[PDB]
Each structure stands twice: as C-alpha cells, then as structure tokens.
Amino acid sequence: LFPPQIKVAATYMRGGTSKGVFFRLQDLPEAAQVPGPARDALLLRVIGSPDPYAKQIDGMGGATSSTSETVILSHSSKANHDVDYLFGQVSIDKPFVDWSGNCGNLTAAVGAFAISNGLIDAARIPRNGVCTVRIWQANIGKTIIAHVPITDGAVQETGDFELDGVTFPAAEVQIEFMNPAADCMFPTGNLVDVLEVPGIGRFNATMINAGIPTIFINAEDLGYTGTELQDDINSDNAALAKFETIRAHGALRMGLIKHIDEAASRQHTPKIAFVAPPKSYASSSGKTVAAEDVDLLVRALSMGKLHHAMMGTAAVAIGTAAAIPGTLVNLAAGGGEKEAVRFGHPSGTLRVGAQAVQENGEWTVIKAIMSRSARVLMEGFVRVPKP
Amino acid sequence: LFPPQIKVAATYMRGGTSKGVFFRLQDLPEAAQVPGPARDALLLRVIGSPDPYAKQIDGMGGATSSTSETVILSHSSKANHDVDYLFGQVSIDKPFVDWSGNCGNLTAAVGAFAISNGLIDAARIPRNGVCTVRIWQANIGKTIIAHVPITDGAVQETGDFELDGVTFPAAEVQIEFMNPAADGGCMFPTGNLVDVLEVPGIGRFNATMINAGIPTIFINAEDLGYTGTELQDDINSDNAALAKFETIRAHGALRMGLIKHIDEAASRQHTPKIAFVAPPKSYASSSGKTVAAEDVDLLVRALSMGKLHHAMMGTAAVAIGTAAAIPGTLVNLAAGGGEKEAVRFGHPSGTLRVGAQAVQENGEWTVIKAIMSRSARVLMEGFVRVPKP
C-alpha cells in the first residue's frame, strides 16, 4: 504493498461563519488541475466523503454544510481580475462535489489567501492599508471584491471586529458582490409567485437569482415564526422533507433544472429560506436579538438542514430582494425603498447593503455589500491515499 | 495593536474513531511547555473553545467530544518506555481542558506520531516491519503499547484494515493496555461486582462500577427503558434523557469515591463515563449496515461529555473488555456469563472486539492486559495559528 499517502499543500481557513480547505491550483496533483472525476475524488477524500456515518472523522470536514467546503484559487488571466475562485461544496453522503454556486462566507478568506500566496500582483498590495482584491467567481461568472487589511506588507488577520456566529473577533474584511443579478434577477419575471408544489400545497414565494438562486417563503405559511433555531427543525424529518420538495419545484419553476428529478443530485442550488417580520428571540449563543435590532428575520436551509447562521450568498439574495419593493423579503421588512437591511438569523444578526435603482420600470443593483472576517487555522500539507 | 497570529508546529490526525491535534512538547511556546493556564489557553484557542455557538467554526475542533481533542507527546524518562503521552479533552462550552483521562482511540496515532517525529530511539525502529512503541500514559500513569507498521523507515499509514466508525481502510495498529485496573481506585472501587445505585426520586439501578481504561458506570439498558440498539438520534435530542444520565453519572461518581459532593459532577464531566449494556440484538448501525445478533456478544452504548457517543471511546472499550472478563459484572452477564477472553460488542457505528486477559492470583482477579486493533493517519501537518497569547 500500500503506497504512502500523497501530500498536497493547503491552507485550512475560517472565512465568515464557515471553514474550508484552500488550494492553489498549481499545488494540486496534476490530474486534479483540470475539472472532472480526479479533482472531485481528491477533494472528496481530503474532506472525508462520502461518509455513511455522516461524521467526516476520516478527513478535514466537520460534517456540516458550512464545514464541508473546498476552494481552488489561481492567478487570473482575465482582464480586471486578480484571482480566479472555484468553490466546491463537498457532499457529506454522496461521492459528489457541487460546482454550481459561490460561497459568500469564504470570500474574505479568498482575498486573504490570494494576498498571502502571491496570486495578486505585488504592486497592488500596499505596505499598510487596504488591498482591494478583484475576484473572478468562476462558478457563477461574477466579480466580487474583497478589501483586505494589510500591515507591514502582510494580511492583517487579527482585530476587534465581531461577526454573529464567529466565536472570536478578527480584522474586518469588507466584501462587495458586483452586479449580483444573474445575467435574470427574477427568472419568472414576477416579484412574487404562487409556487405549486405537488403533494404539499400552494405557497407565495419570491424566487430571485442574486448571490445564489434563492426561494423565499413566509415563515407563517409553514407554521413557523422566524425565530426558530436548528434544534426546532433539524431533527424533524417530515419538516425537512417538506422544505426539500418545495426547493425542488422552485428550482424547476426558476428554470434551473429541466426536470424535477435533477434536484436529487443538485442539492446546493437553489437555496430555500423563510422570512418573517422582526420578533425578539434568544440566538444560538444565548444572546437576545431584540425585534428593534433587526428589519426582518430570515432562516435558510443548506444541503437539507437549517443553516446555523446565514450563507453569504443568501445574504446577498436577502439584501437584493429587500431593496426591491414588493418581494416577500421587502414586505417582511416593512416595505418601501431600502438601501440596506439587518436581518436576524439563528446566530444573531447580519447587515447587508444593496441599493436598487428603478428606471423604465426595471430594477437594477450595482452591488451588494457586507463585512466579514477571516483567519488561517492551519497551514501546511493535507494527506490522502495515493489516487 | 493586534499582533500577527503565532504559528505552532502541529499534526492533525485521525486515531481510531477520533480526530485530534498533536504537538511535540518542544514545539510549544515556552510558557506552554509545562501544565498550566498558558498551555490550556493555547489548546483552547487552537480548538476554537470556549464556543457559545457550539460549532467550533473558529478553530480545529469539530464540535463533538471525539473531535475536540489535543495531545502532547515528549521523550519519556520512565524506564522501559519510549514516549510520554498527555491527552487534553477540550470543553466545547467552557474555558477548560480536562487532563484526568486517557484517549484510547488516539493511542494508535500517538505511536505513529512518536515514530514520525523523532521521539523514539532509532535503534527501536526497523527499516521494515513492526515498531513496538511503549507509551507512558501520563494522565493516568499506565503503560500502553502500540504496534506500528513500518515501511522504508517510515510509518505505514495506508492499508486494508477496516474499523466500524472509520470511513476508509488503513493499516492495522494493534494496541495493548497493560495492567488496566486502577491502583476511586482499584478495579472495583465499591468492592462489589454489581451494586444497586440509589438515585432518590429518579430510580434504583443495578450497576457495575469499574476503574479500568477509564472509570466507568455500566447499567442495564432495560432499567432505563432502552434496548441497547439506540442510535445518537434516539438520545441526543432528548434533553430529559441526557439530564437523567447525568444525574445517574453523578451519583455513580459519588458512590465510587471519585467525588465527595454530588455537585462536583458539574465540573468533572470527563470521568467517570456512563454506559448501558444489553444482550445481543440485531440493529441497523448509523451507517445503515445491519449488525446481526449473532455478530456480537453484547450491546454497549456510552455517553461522553453529556452525549451518546457515535461509536465507542477506546478507554470505555477497555472497561468493557475488562468487565466482560470478570464473571458476574453486568457486562459479563449481558455477554452470557462465565470466563471470557474477549468480547465483540455492538455500538452505534457497528462492532468492536476487545480482549482482556483475566487470571486469578491469590483467589482474586488480575487483568494482565486489554487489547484491540485500531488504525491512524495524518490528515494535515504543518502549523496551527492562534492570536498572540
């Protein structure tokens, strides 16, 4: 006989409320330097998947969607970009890596990794200040900007900026998702649709493609209040099944898939989320989120479970939808023109800015913005058995 | 002024059904090279604790007891030992690292780490074959042996040996826990093979309390209304059940003499362990595989740090094998009674075989050793980072 494990240079990082394994493209084994089965098999093995035990005890994964994540970065040859970014959502249970979406939380870590690993021109890095990293999000074909603080020519990781869902403070990293609307913001052409879901019921829904394709429904239409924590939903098999059926049909209605059964393998996109007007609740850390602290409540699912905080991509979808009068998100937030919203999720709150402009009946959004943070947890070499 | 993070050389490994962060003593910052608050603070931050979110998203931990684990290894000064092993169980919710126990699953990884990191006399490492690593378990003062395979002067990590609860095969590493009975000491601190554990207002529970591998309270599944086939989802979302187990564990700790006041159990979470046992019965494991009644001698489920464990703690496996070898314990009786040189028990992830050699001496039981096979592999090697202490 059994050959030794191979070593692959890698960095394990927290970005926002997620953890991922990061690779320079050139550090991957040659076979994995192009998309396909060899790359996917390698990433699966690094993470510890597929795992019928659902624990990822034999890999780098943490057995949750927000800890079963891989990133491949390279210097970009594209005009006006520094770094090319591929995000792979590694299935816990299936031998599958999903490449259909971005990861918003890891974006801050992408910027930092790029700087620390020479993927941006040295001339673009100030000695002290803020380095603006232009990221080509290669999964979805979008520009994202990470403003990473620099001290003495190196990434400033540590700091006093707090994120709800991140245990310890770190340096603030401002992110900007440019032109988030898919090249349509509303695939159905409607702000709100009646989603026909065979076997479940009829649901008013806003389906938006900004940040990530997302289906928003009202909490009350599912018997929820919007203050739910993970334990209220993630042990409820019937409830989880209801959510998945809706997501599948939404995917079809959005024209993301050609047929309903594609949703079985395509778990990662679209996302499904429920919204509610402000209401006070204790977050997962025990801290009180007061109704006055937020504009609305949003809970989202990822890979079949209620997410512990909020996906960064879904935060973009929330901010963008809130800015367009008449979406379910906008209405949950009290209606009107909104240039930003702070929403309550299970771990606390998150503020996203998105200014929309109307001209000739159409709504456009130049960018959605939010702050995150990132830090290296471990750097060196991951090992897997010889492929 | 927010200084850069410090870097500490470390290796992240799977050992058995657990993951932990491993350090050579000499690689630690000076202040952390002795037991104390500086060491504990470093390890807490590496793992991502204390974490009110209970997710450990800001460290190396995986938000379960079997993935919130640290190990410090050093050259031994003990006669006939190669390496000293300290295990730190890192609390998820409190700023606390518990040093009162061993970790059995990580023992195979300890052997491998020691060989790979210059802690073993080169004369004892063959170019090819088996390196017998003599480990001084410094938490509990016991000898443990790891037979680590060697190829081309390096640890042979990969192989075809499978463990239930470990996703992928690897090289078999046989482990031997020498003289596992404690010197709340003695093999049976109450002096009885079975006791009646009185928990006023909660129940009366027949129990075997044994100190071998780790102090452990065994009760019969049926006395709790369980069958022994339970999986994590049957217990870990049941706050009533978890509270009941904790009260029983506290009363067992008091009865064993491990604590003097019942309230001490709140801070002393790591030891003793509590487990429940039953005769063989068929069930689907957490992976979906059927464990047939014929495949096992008994069923055992254990809790660790207030949750049903996903597989079995290696220390508790030693307690199971040892108790099973002593005729009349609840474990022995669940396995059909009589002398028993080994048992295969069913846990939530499948089965585990443990052998324990019990021999009479002066009309009293002695247990020479307990043995089992595990495996280990490096997951990531390099440097962990934390903000400057």
Residue numbers in the entry:
A (entry chain B): 5 to 187, 194 to 397
B (entry chain A): 5 to 187, 192 to 397
From the paper:
Previous crystallographic data identified residues C107 and K73 in the active site of SoPrpF as likely to be involved in catalysis. In contrast, none of the variants with substitutions at residue K73 supported growth under either condition suggestive of proteins that either lacked catalytic activity or were misfolded. To further understand the roles of residues K73 and C107, we solved the three-dimensional crystal structure of Apo-SoPrpFK73E, which crystallized in space group P21 with cell dimensions a = 51.8 b = 103.4 c = 78.1 Å, and contained two monomers per asymmetric unit. SoPrpF assembles to form a homodimer and buries 2400Å2 of surface area per monomer, which represents 15% of each monomer’s total surface area. While the SoPrpFK73E variant structure can be superposed closely with both the apo-PrpFWT and trans-aconitate bound structures with rms differences of 0.6 Å and 0.4 Å over 385 α-carbon respectively, an alignment of the N-terminal domains from residues 5–185 reveals that the C-terminal domain of the SoPrpFK73E structure rotates into a more open conformation. The C-terminal domain rotates ~4.4° between the extremes provided by the apo (closed) and aconitate (open) bound forms. A comparison of the three structures showed that the trans-aconitate bound structure was in the most open conformation, while the SoPrpFK73E structure was intermediate and the apo-SoPrpFWT structure was in the most closed conformation. Similarly, a malonate molecule derived from the crystallization solution was bound in the active site of the SoPrpFK73E structure. Because malonate is larger than glycerol and smaller than trans-aconitate, the C-terminal domain adopted an intermediary conformation. Attempts to obtain substrate complexed SoPrpFK73E crystals by co-crystallization or soaking into apo crystals with either trans-aconitate or 2-methylcitrate were not successful. This difficulty in co-crystallization was not surprising since binding of trans-aconitate into the SoPrpFK73E active site would position a substrate carboxyl moiety within 3 Å of the new glutamate carboxyl group of SoPrpFK73E variant, thus creating an unfavorable interaction.
